[PDB]
Amino acid sequence: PNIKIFSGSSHQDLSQKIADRLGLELGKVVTKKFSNQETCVEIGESVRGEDVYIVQSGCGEINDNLMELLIMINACKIASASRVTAVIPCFPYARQDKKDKSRAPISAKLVANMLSVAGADHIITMDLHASQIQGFFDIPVDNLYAEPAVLKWIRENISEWRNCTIVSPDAGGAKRVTSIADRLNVDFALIHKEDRMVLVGDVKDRVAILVDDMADTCGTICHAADKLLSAGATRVYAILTHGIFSGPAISRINNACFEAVVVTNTIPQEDKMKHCSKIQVIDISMILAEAIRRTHNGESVSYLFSHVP
Amino acid sequence: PNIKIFSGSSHQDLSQKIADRLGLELGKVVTKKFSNQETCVEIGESVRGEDVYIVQSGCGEINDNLMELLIMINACKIASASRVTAVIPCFPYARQDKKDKSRAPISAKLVANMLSVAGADHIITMDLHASQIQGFFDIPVDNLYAEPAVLKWIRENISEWRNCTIVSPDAGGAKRVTSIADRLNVDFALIHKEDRMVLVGDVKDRVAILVDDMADTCGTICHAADKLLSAGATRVYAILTHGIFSGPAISRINNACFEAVVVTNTIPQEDKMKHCSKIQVIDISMILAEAIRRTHNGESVSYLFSHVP
Amino acid sequence: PNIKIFSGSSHQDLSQKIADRLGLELGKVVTKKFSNQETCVEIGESVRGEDVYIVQSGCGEINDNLMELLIMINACKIASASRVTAVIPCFPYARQDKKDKSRAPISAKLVANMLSVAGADHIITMDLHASQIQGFFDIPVDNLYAEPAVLKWIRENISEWRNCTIVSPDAGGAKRVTSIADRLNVDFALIHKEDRMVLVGDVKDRVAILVDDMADTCGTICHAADKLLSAGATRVYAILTHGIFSGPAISRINNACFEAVVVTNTIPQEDKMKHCSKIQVIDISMILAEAIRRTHNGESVSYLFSHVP
Amino acid sequence: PNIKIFSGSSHQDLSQKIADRLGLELGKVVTKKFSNQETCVEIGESVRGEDVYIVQSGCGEINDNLMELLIMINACKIASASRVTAVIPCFPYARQDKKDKSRAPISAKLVANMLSVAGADHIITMDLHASQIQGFFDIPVDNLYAEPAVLKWIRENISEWRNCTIVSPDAGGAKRVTSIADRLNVDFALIHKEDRMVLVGDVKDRVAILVDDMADTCGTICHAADKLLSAGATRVYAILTHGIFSGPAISRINNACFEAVVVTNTIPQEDKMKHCSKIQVIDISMILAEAIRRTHNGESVSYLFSHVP
Amino acid sequence: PNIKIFSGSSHQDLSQKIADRLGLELGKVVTKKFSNQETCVEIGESVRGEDVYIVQSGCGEINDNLMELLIMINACKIASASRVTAVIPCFPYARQDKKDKSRAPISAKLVANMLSVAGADHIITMDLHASQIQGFFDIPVDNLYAEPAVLKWIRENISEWRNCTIVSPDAGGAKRVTSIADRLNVDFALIHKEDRMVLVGDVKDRVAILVDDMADTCGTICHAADKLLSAGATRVYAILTHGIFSGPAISRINNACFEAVVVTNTIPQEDKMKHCSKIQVIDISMILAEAIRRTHNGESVSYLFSHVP
Ligand SMILES: Nc1ncnc2c1ncn2[C@@H]1O[C@H](COP(=O)(O)OP(=O)(O)OP(=O)(O)O)[C@@H](O)[C@H]1O
Ligand SMILES: Nc1ncnc2c1ncn2[C@@H]1O[C@H](COP(=O)(O)OP(=O)(O)OP(=O)(O)O)[C@@H](O)[C@H]1O
Ligand SMILES: Nc1ncnc2c1ncn2[C@@H]1O[C@H](COP(=O)(O)OP(=O)(O)OP(=O)(O)O)[C@@H](O)[C@H]1O
Ligand SMILES: Nc1ncnc2c1ncn2[C@@H]1O[C@H](COP(=O)(O)OP(=O)(O)OP(=O)(O)O)[C@@H](O)[C@H]1O
Ligand SMILES: Nc1ncnc2c1ncn2[C@@H]1O[C@H](COP(=O)(O)OP(=O)(O)OP(=O)(O)O)[C@@H](O)[C@H]1O
Ligand SMILES: [Mg+2]
Ligand SMILES: [Mg+2]
Ligand SMILES: [Mg+2]
Ligand SMILES: [Mg+2]
Ligand SMILES: [Mg+2]
Ligand SMILES: [Mg+2]
Ligand SMILES: [Mg+2]
Ligand SMILES: [Mg+2]
Ligand SMILES: [Mg+2]
Ligand SMILES: [Mg+2]
């Protein structure tokens, strides 16, 4: 059983980077639309008895990409692939992980059920919005972390990183920032709203680094950055694993005081970089490629939680 | 068939680093000396049907270490190991690779024959003194290169690396330096002796980096560094993959003008670092571990010739 | 046990010269081709209990000549010759002596293995491309040197030889030229490429003598000669032990500034001399004959490294 | 371990047919000549841990093709292929399988030794001239038979095949023809020379089918066909597994009385078909492909001795 | 072909004694260490067509001496010596001649393989620990016996030798002592441990002579001597062919009751004699010289099993 990497249409550059790191060519697949806009998928090579990995992120036209992924999984499964793995760098509907006093769907659970019923045997993803989403599955889920790559970027790009403060934009992400603060041996601050925000932790004359899983409309991080500059910070960075940047995010970032907005490439960023000078991209294709290769060879994946490959 | 890593007594720190990078514990082996100083080897665990890797460098008490390696290979082979690989970071007797108008042995060929007859199926080594030594074997030999790690060190440690000159100490190593000069887009200079040395290539007001496979007595690199300072160089570095440092090497380096003497850890360096402040060590255990893991899994090893893992 | 000299079809003039110097007639052998172009060999006399020497150079139709040599060795060995020696003035595939970051064969090692398995007990050759090729064998290899004959030619043909400069075309051959420069007590210069070439050593108003093991396409020596004339040299000679002269070599030499291109007769040269006026031939049949006679009589062969017989 | 099929330059059409029947693409390899006509081989993809099959027949420029095959085997073996198999449809030097009161080489044994020393683990060939050549190896040799394909051709092309006579051109091939005569339930005749030939077996008013392993100069089969027409045969066919057709074979066949000269495609035939109308080709690529696939999967190869796949 | 005797650095006095008995001078060889402690060997005279004997015992720095011997053998073999013989008075790793329910090497077999692959044609040794080691070779091995010299010493040094008892220290050596007891016409006793030892055979008022192949730490012979004095012996001698005397052997012998500890000079003894008064040395250089001369002249070597020359 050999590795076969297939790309959905969502993030083809990431799939190519992963394939190069694995020393493989992308599997032959046609993924287009019929005239009535139904997804058309044709696997152009035999996957019989192979270990198939389908790379598709929850970005762009999310429902189209999700249906493409489900259809590709189904096609590979009924084509007698030995194992089918969904590599989903940004998990769609992850923020709908609970009801919370509302007659709302748990869309993340529905997506997990659909992936299971399509025939996925395994899920590889990066920085799930809530790690409880792992429990939405009955198949194994490897939730990778961008934190090693983030730490690497911080050390090689922020000269004052030993005196910086890692800041959570809200009370929800504090855990994450504390982890980073522990790995860098720096202070960590929290910010939460009472339209006013309150900040705990000295940030004067120090570089502040907001850290988060995602930036969708960037209202949260822009408000946090305004507060950090109010409290005497020297420069404010924002580091996010998922740069969705929908709606007014680009305009707000352009009008914000960030020195840089670093995001990983779990979502393609070329279009946003055109209209926003201060967006920078961390490659995480090495982490994804190593996770694929370790799941295939039966090596430890959790080794990657703390080690940059 | 699983990976089993065994350490000879020559370089136990390197073996441990490799084992950690592989996520494995070192195999149980007793390697001591009988009273009459014959090597005693006892494999403390079953290696039947396993892929065995024995790590032993040509350093320290070279003949003792070589005999230890041969005895361990023999013990694993008659213990029904599926495959036995010798991981020899610094190949012993590599400099005796030819006769050249002398009634001399070709000791490198003798060592290759002894390794083959002991039962080695495969050799992993780093920067063979002459790559023709690969032809001394009939079994496959993977000759790894420290060059990716050297390039990484140069970029992250020499601030002026874009304006530096890579210098060969002699005409023999020019190929190597040209390779490095190609990967950095810098000038390359040669130095050869006519007790006088002649240098080709502008080095004034520029950082010079001597590059070589090994430093035994360091007469070559010390003379080259003196010449480089004569020709107006600003600082002179020396980068070698094998830091043997025998005889008067430490005193000469201490009396030399080197800013630093960077060597890889194919040979243990802790004792030399005690008596020489300007020696610095590049870890190459990641390259060796990746080579072991790729030979085991049937992935491409030559991928490592240009990529730091 | 008497000497029997057999000629392959590659270089019959050299075999005849060697046989005359030994006071012997060439052994009766038929070496032709079957209709389907397979080599046909028939030993026309008994070689039982004899010391057999088969002369065949790696020239012309190289694979045909090599197969002829292997077949003749096999025929003599199963005909109960006491000892079989391959006299190979120019060793085929000598330039494929290593892999060097390529998925390439080590063809020189393969040729050595084939010669050993055909039944060769001993190899006599001249100026191996790399002396490490000696280690590719387990049988003894005598690598003779054309240097004594070259020194003789230089003294008797270049009137200004005491003020000449011996020049290496590249960094690889410097050793050789230094040896010659030591035996003549003259200056030695190096030339290496950075499409531009750099020359170290005064050559103005002095005769320059490029020295090398072989000239295949003569791009190297022609570029070196152009550079030497640029640097004010009076006349430029080229002396090579192996005159392969394949491809465009004859046209380039005809368009080059060489006063003469001296080569030994390890490879037949009559055809090339027809189309190139400035090619001159040094006879080395005396060295080969003396080496054969000394190996037969158990006298010192290395005596020939410095003495013209 | 996957199948990798590599083509030598001798018979690229056959290699492509085999690759298509296996559902594979031919492995990336460069096989050209250096300027001095030495074979140049570069394996363009990793073969590490793979089951490598190199297809090269003993045809055309036989010594060049044989050296190409040996060099490719060596390149794959030192590139750490798990297993290397030589697929040699027509075995070179097969007719030099003995000495027989001559001081001649046993060239077939030399070729076997060279293949073994190059690193071949297994040989697949078709209709060895003498099956004793199998004993020239110590590695397994699968000698396939064209007889099933020949029987198929006879039944579907000769309408009178139930009343035909299978004829041996000489006493040596009688076994073969008897085998065929047994599988068709027809008469079998022998022909041997006393310049006159004597024929045993009624052939009047019956179609005669000469059968043989090879046709080199076609003197044997042309003389046999003349004798068969003398003895009242209606039509004479010739069926050979190896159509070498060297020397005057094409002219003799054109002047002969054969209805057809059927040969297998162990040797490329397109050029000969241009100048000879009555040559016809049986495809045996299915037999070779099935043999490769069965050796790879550990299924029975001898199943193919009697079954067309 | 003449005799050439070369000395390794292990036992130069023995080599000189052998050379004098042969009427020869020791061959010119340089055997030193490079700076990094690799063995350096240079044969200072032509050995072409000669019968070369290299004398090196398994004593002192055993792995260094063994590597020296292998390198010297290789140098002589590629220097076209007609025959190379290793004269190894004490065979290294002889006690590691089996595994015996342990995952241990058979180091003696490895040493034999290394000697064969270095190019040894013949082995001369004295009192192999187990004569089965002869079967570890495919080349002839002459295992000489010190017994004639021991018998001579006993008769000329022990006045009561006709009434003495020859004693084995263990059950393993009984054969040897019985041989001696047969040649002297005396009683023979055995001793074996049950920390207690049991002795069979009357030894009261009689001189006892322990006999053995080697004394390494001398625990065995010291315990045996204590038991012999317990059983009423008058004086106790110990005679060993190999006096290794490593570890605490000298102190134990000094504290033991031995009248004398006689050893042969297969291992140099001058240093041990300085610190131990009761060590005495039998010269066996006459046996070794006669064995060399008889192998050279084709005379019977086994003649020496019973005759002092
Ligand atoms: N794609 C989406 N874009 C924007 N809002 C979304 C999206 N999907 C779900 N939501 C809504 O966003 C809210 C979830 O917000 P969020 O994850 O920031 O906070 P939380 O889950 O309440 O707390 P926390 O993550 O801090 O523990 C819900 O009201 C949910 O319906
Ligand atoms: N361990 C050793 N320490 C020192 N010198 C050694 C050692 N082993 C061999 N030598 C000697 O060193 C010489 C080889 O030197 P070196 O490798 O620097 O140059 P080279 O092979 O002549 O040329 P180059 O490597 O530049 O092509 C030989 O004379 C060899 O005998
Ligand atoms: N017959 C041949 N003709 C031309 N090129 C060849 C031939 N055989 C091998 N080569 C190629 O030529 C190259 C070897 O070149 P060359 O011997 O001039 O330099 P090198 O070995 O890199 O260095 P140097 O000899 O200076 O130490 C390799 O790429 C090899 O594949
Ligand atoms: N390529 C070749 N082309 C032509 N003749 C060859 C070739 N190779 C060898 N020969 C010669 O052909 C003869 C072998 O002929 P052939 O195989 O037809 O008959 P055989 O071996 O004597 O008997 P049979 O095969 O009938 O049992 C030998 O003299 C051999 O030297
Ligand atoms: N150089 C050495 N010094 C000490 N012990 C050694 C040495 N080499 C091997 N040994 C160990 O010594 C043991 C062999 O002991 P010894 O030869 O005295 O007895 P044996 O082979 O069991 O029996 P015996 O020789 O009486 O038939 C083994 O355990 C072996 O590993
Ligand atoms: Mg939430
Ligand atoms: Mg949040
Ligand atoms: Mg060297
Ligand atoms: Mg050097
Ligand atoms: Mg070269
Ligand atoms: Mg060159
Ligand atoms: Mg025949
Ligand atoms: Mg026939
Ligand atoms: Mg024992
Ligand atoms: Mg004992």
From Swiss-Prot, chains A, B, C, D, E:
Its EC number is 2.7.6.1. GO terms for molecular function: ATP binding; identical protein binding; kinase activity; magnesium ion binding; protein homodimerization activity; ribose phosphate diphosphokinase activity. Pfam families: Pribosyl_synth, Pribosyltran_N. Pathway: Metabolic intermediate biosynthesis; 5-phospho-alpha-D-ribose 1-diphosphate biosynthesis; 5-phospho-alpha-D-ribose 1-diphosphate from D-ribose 5-phosphate (route I): step 1/1. Changing residue 143 to H: No effect on catalytic activity. Keywords: ATP-binding, Charcot-Marie-Tooth disease, Deafness, Disease variant, Gout, Intellectual disability, Kinase, Magnesium, Metal-binding, Neurodegeneration, Neuropathy, Non-syndromic deafness, Nucleotide biosynthesis, Nucleotide-binding, Retinitis pigmentosa, Transferase. InterPro entries: PRib_PP_synth_CS (IPR000842), Pribosyltran_N (IPR029099), PRibTrfase_dom (IPR000836), PRTase-like (IPR029057), Rib-P_diPkinase (IPR005946), Rib-P_diPkinase_bac (IPR037515). Changing residue 131 to A: Reduces catalytic activity. ATP binds at residues 95-100, 129. Mg(2+) binds at residues 127, 129, 138, 142. CDD domains: PRTases_typeI (cd06223). Changing residue 145 to F: No effect on catalytic activity. GO terms for biological process: 5-phosphoribose 1-diphosphate biosynthetic process; hypoxanthine biosynthetic process; nervous system development; purine nucleobase metabolic process; purine nucleotide biosynthetic process; pyrimidine nucleotide biosynthetic process; ribonucleoside monophosphate biosynthetic process; urate biosynthetic process. Residues 204-219 are annotated as: Binding of phosphoribosylpyrophosphate. Its cofactor is Mg(2+). GO terms for cellular component: cytoplasm; cytosol; ribose phosphate diphosphokinase complex. Catalyzes the synthesis of phosphoribosylpyrophosphate (PRPP) that is essential for nucleotide synthesis. Belongs to the ribose-phosphate pyrophosphokinase family. Homodimer. The active form is probably a hexamer composed of 3 homodimers. NCBIfam families: PRK01259.1, ribP_PPkin. This is Ribose-phosphate pyrophosphokinase 1. It comes from Homo sapiens (Human).
